[PDB]
Amino acid sequence: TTALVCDNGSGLVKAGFAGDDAPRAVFPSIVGRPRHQGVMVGMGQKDSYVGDEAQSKRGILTLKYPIEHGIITNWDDMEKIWHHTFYNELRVAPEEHPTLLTEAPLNPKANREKMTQIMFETFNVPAMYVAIQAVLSLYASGRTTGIVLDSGDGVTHNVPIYEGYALPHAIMRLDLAGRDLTDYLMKILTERGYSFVTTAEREIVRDIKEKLCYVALDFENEMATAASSSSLEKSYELPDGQVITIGNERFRCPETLFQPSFIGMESAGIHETTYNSIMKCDIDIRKDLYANNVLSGGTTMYPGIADRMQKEITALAPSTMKIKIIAPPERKYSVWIGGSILASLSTFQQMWISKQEYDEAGPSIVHRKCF
Amino acid sequence: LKDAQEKLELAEKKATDAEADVASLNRRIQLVEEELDRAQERLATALQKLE
Amino acid sequence: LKDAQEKLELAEKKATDAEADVASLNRRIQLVEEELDRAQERLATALQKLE
Ligand SMILES: Nc1ncnc2c1ncn2[C@@H]1O[C@H](COP(=O)(O)OP(=O)(O)O)[C@@H](O)[C@H]1O
Ligand SMILES: [Mg+2]
Structure with missing residues (x-):
């Protein structure tokens, strides 16, 4: 059967079957209970409007995102969002489809374990796999090296990768988004x-x-x-x-983004955390990372950012290296396109966390070999 | 409505056409830039050899 | 619809702007193709001088 490539994100949930070009259903991830009293009887008023329905009745709701910074702070609302995504926006029961969630780097373990426990107990999927949101964005570009700056709506993280070997000591995660x-x-x-x-x-x-x-x-x-x-x-x-x-x-x-001192944050901008992430890498792969800087995520869609960032890095970097910034027009859905490509691979077909494996080792299976 | 219908259809077709054009041209510009850079690296190799 | 009318007009304008960038990307493609040919030639002469 086909795999479900869901992508929780924070701000827009993007989902769709594996092997396509664009997500099938994209809708804000907000759950808003009504706040006024309500006098009409029999109007059929529900207790919580989720997804794109609550962006039309938002005049009398109190919208609240269930995902603050990558991490999930309100598990009941997130379960509601997932249930809506599966049953009403795709109309495919999860009992017959593998799922491929995505997660930001350096997130708390409990979040990931609870995510897999929900997917296996409540929705009862056949097999689910959790992938880092930057490797997918690198898949979508068709590269195999490069340092990807995935400035989403929740959290901005900067994962450098060379020849397929990720460098775990050079991930710089910043919470401005x-x-x-x-x-x-x-x-x-x-x-x-x-x-x-x-x-x-x-x-x-x-x-x-x-x-x-x-x-x-x-x-x-x-x-x-x-x-x-x-x-x-x-x-x-x-x-x-x-x-x-x-x-x-x-x-x-x-x-x-380039001066986080405006909102009182201490850290350096997205123009300097990329250079710092590069300089932590080894001395022999810095040229390739300089030449293959990748942008992704929604927030990198501002008109004129691919030039400002290149100017800043060229100012910081040595004068000889060539600085190139890959900014594909399909930036917003880059992570999901990469997720579809990864789920469509034959070599990947045996990496899923099969349900019997979860039954034998509990939710802590995700940290094990099946990453 | 019919007027709005035709306007909507024509604008949508024009938009999709422009999007396809600019996307394919972006792919072309990527390819030509690759040509330029790889040729430049050949230039550097040749310079080192001659010197 | 009036708002759909404005939306279709704006989308067709966006299509036309994408076409203006289509023209600019065409210019980039052509000039970079000249660069590619010039690089082929210069690399040939550099290798010959190396010989
Ligand atoms: N065209 C755009 N121009 C500027 N900012 C945008 C644009 N589209 C989306 N954004 C910003 O990006 C966010 C969506 O980011 P997204 O990539 O969906 O996050 P996630 O990684 O959670 O999916 C929105 O909250 C919005 O603030
Ligand atoms: Mg994202």
Whole structure:
């Protein structure tokens, strides 16, 4: 039979059968209970709208993501999300399909063990396998080397790989991602008068960020230009009218990636954690990693980031090496495409964690040889 | 509606066409850049040999 | 639909912008092909000088 390549993610759940080009169903991972009282009788009001249904009734719900930073903080809601994904968005019972979840690097063990225990006890799948979210993004590019920066919505991690041999001592995981950029944008919009507070209006700020923000090639020049002319002010229409005008908030929101001091984080930007991740590698594979830097994940879709990052790394790196940044147009679904490719391989067909194996060793089987 | 229908269909076809064009052209630009870089490495080899 | 009308118009505009980048990528492809041919020739002459 065919395998189910699910990809929990944090912000958008992407799923679909193995062997295709794009995920079959992509929908936000939010579960929102209603918060008001409700007076109409017999309206058929449910107790929790999940997935894309709660992005249409969000006016009277309190949306809450079940995955904070890679890790899962609310297991009941995550179980609900998985149940919805299997039964309503794909309509395939899990009793007859292997599953291939994905997990960020350096995550707590208990999260992974609970994930496998749920998949084997509640949904009762035949066999499931958990894979690191960066190796798949490297599969999708058709490479076999390279250092991949997978800046998702929950957590940004940077896994270097050479000739198929991952370097476990050079993984640099940073917890700044799209959600923190949404919060920072929502916080700097208040400087013009627009106040978004409700958990429903966070979605509106996210839409503003997606449609308007861009990464500046040079920050100081853009700050000077936006403060003199008015060629940058782009307007946007809220879900009820009252258009708003975003000035130099456009390139200040995604600039937080390269200067995490804006949101008070100590660490260095995504332009310098990649160079540090490279320098921890051996001295003889640094040229190949320099030449095959891969971008993935949703948050790396800002217009103009593949040039800013290349300029920064070229500034840091030695002058002789060639710096090349691979930015495929299908960046958002790169991890899932790689997952489909991996699940479609014949050599991989015996790596699944078969159910009888789980019955013999318990949920701690995932840390064992079947990784 | 019918007017909207035709508008929607035509815009969708145009969008898909542009996407396919730009994707294939991206593949082409990748290939030509590979040509350039690999040729450059040949250049370096030749330079070392001659010197 | 009016909003679907605006969406289809915006998507067709996006298609046209992708076509403008299609033109720019075509220019990149052509110039890099010139580079490839020039590199073939220069590498040939360098190897000959090596001989
Ligand atoms: N076109 C875009 N431009 C800018 N940011 C985007 C775009 N699309 C998605 N994002 C950001 O990326 C996030 C989705 O990232 P995604 O790759 O789905 O995360 P995950 O790894 O959990 O799947 C969204 O929250 C949004 O903030
Ligand atoms: Mg991801």
